Amino acid sequence: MHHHHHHTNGYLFREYIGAQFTGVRFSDVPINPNLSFNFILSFAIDYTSPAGGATPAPTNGVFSPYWDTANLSPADVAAVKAAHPNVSVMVGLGGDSVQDTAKVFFSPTSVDSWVANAVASVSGIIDAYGLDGVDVDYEHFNDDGGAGVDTFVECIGRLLTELKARHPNITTSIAPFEDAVVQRYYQPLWRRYAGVIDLVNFQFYTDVPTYVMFYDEQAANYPGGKVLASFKTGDVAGLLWPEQGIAGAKELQRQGKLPGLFIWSADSSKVSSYGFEYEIKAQEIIANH
């Protein structure tokens, strides 16, 4: 039977930046003036510092910036936004590791204690940097006796609900990927708290044979037409990866299935053999339907 024609194509491009300390600055990244552009500062983490060889440990939701704050400061956020009225800057929470040391687990002491610490500390980072929202990117779960799915759903849902109360215009997102545990944690969060989660930054970087079939699996896992496509730069596999992402994004857009697109990461692109070419190509697609 005919499938309903999708009507979701949008004008959003997002760029993760700051995790890899390659000297990248907002001003290095080409910004297409004909779309909505977001940077995502990578990452604030509720772990202690690894500086000088210390072992990071969970802080129960007391987040600190661990991106390259020297090159991506509050003044730098203000400057890129003054030069580019289409730019917003968000803070990412979590990520894989604490500056390439300990893996970042979702490890609350309790819902209420973690939420209280997370609201205060993340609101503090949003205030200090003048930010426009928050991306939730927990990727490691203690799924065999540690903090379970309902604890995660309540922690993130209540954090985003209170931030939407305190910063009513902010943009929230979640960043799941295709891992059975990760999907079990994020799918019920979207079901129970979609009202306070604006975007799904699904990481597409399976035996599913095509990019669009893989995307449609996630559109069905996270209903509402707000799943962004994505790809990664600076890959061991080379330009094969990003070229498949570009082709996938073009095919999604042909089908009305491309609300937006994001790249991991500015830092990787900067030191790649292709510079920011994929940011330019991705933004050309998003700006010119």
Which CATH number belongs to the domain containing residue 143 in this structure?
Answer: 3.20.20.80
Q: Residues 21, 68: contact at Cβ < 8 Å?
A: yes
Q: Residues 67, 39: contact at Cβ < 8 Å?
A: no
6 part of a folded domain: no
What is the domain count for the chain?
1
Six-digit token string for 184: 């079990």
How far apart CA 276 and CA 265 sit, in angstroms, is 10
Q: What technique determined this structure?
A: X-ray
42 part of a folded domain: yes
Q: Which 3 state secondary structure label does DSSP give 49?
A: coil
Identify the sign of the CA torsion 207, 210, 214, 217. negative
The distance from CA 244 to its chain's CA centroid, rounded to whole angstroms, is 20
Identify which of 288, 279, 252, 258 has the alpha carbon closest to the alpha carbon of residue 37: 279
Identify which of 187, 184, 235, 255 has the alpha carbon closest to the alpha carbon of residue 8: 255
Strand-strand pairing, 64-65 and 36-45:
antiparallel
281 part of a folded domain: yes
5 part of a folded domain: no
86 part of a folded domain: yes
Strand-strand pairing, 105-106 and 87-94:
unpaired
4 part of a folded domain: no
Domain holding 221, by residue range, is 12-287
The secondary element (H helix, E strand) that includes residue 126 is helix 111-129
Q: Which amino acid is at 78?
A: A
Identify the sign of the CA torsion 75, 272, 241, 183. negative
Six-digit token string for 219: 């559109």
- Tell me 89's DSSP state: E
43 part of a folded domain: yes
Six-digit token string for 203: 């990481």
Gap positions in the chain, given as the residue before each gap (C–N > 2.5 A)? 205
How far apart CA 243 and CA 81 sit, in angstroms, is 30
Six-digit token string for 66: 């661990």
Q: What is the largest CA-CA distance in the chain?
A: 62
How far apart CA 32 and CA 29 sit, in angstroms, is 10
Six-digit token string for 190: 């979207």
Identify which of 29, 152, 157 has the alpha carbon closest to the alpha carbon of residue 89: 29
Neighbours of 250 (CB within 10 A): 14
How far apart CA 89 and CA 211 sit, in angstroms, is 28
3-state class percentages of the chain: helix first, strand second, coil last, to nearest 5:
40, 20, 40
The secondary element (H helix, E strand) that includes residue 212 is helix 211-221
- Tell me 6's DSSP state: P
Neighbours of 170 (CB within 10 A): 19
Question: Helices 240-254 & 277-287, crossing angle to 10 degrees?
Answer: 0
Q: Residues 208, 167: contact at Cβ < 8 Å?
A: no
Q: First-to-last CA distance in the chain? A: 27
Identify any residues that bridge with 44 across adjacent strands, giving them in sequence order. 65, 93
CA angle 282, 14, 161 (to 5 degrees): 150
Burial annotation 209-244 (CB, 10 A radius, 16+ → b, else e)? eebbebbbbbbebbeeebbbbbbbbbeeeeeebbee
Strand-strand pairing, 171-174 and 64-65:
unpaired
* Residue 220, CA distances (Å) to 83, 171, 191 in order: 38, 22, 12
Length of the chain: 289
How far apart CA 105 and CA 284 sit, in angstroms, is 36
Question: Helices 180-193 & 211-221, crossing angle to 10 degrees?
Answer: 50
Phi-psi region of 114 (alpha: psi -120 to 50; beta: other; left: phi over 0): alpha
**Residues classed as catalytic:** 139
Give all strands (DSSP E) within 5-126, no chain letters: 12-17, 36-45, 64-65, 87-94, 105-106
Q: Which amino acid is at 162?
A: E
87 part of a folded domain: yes
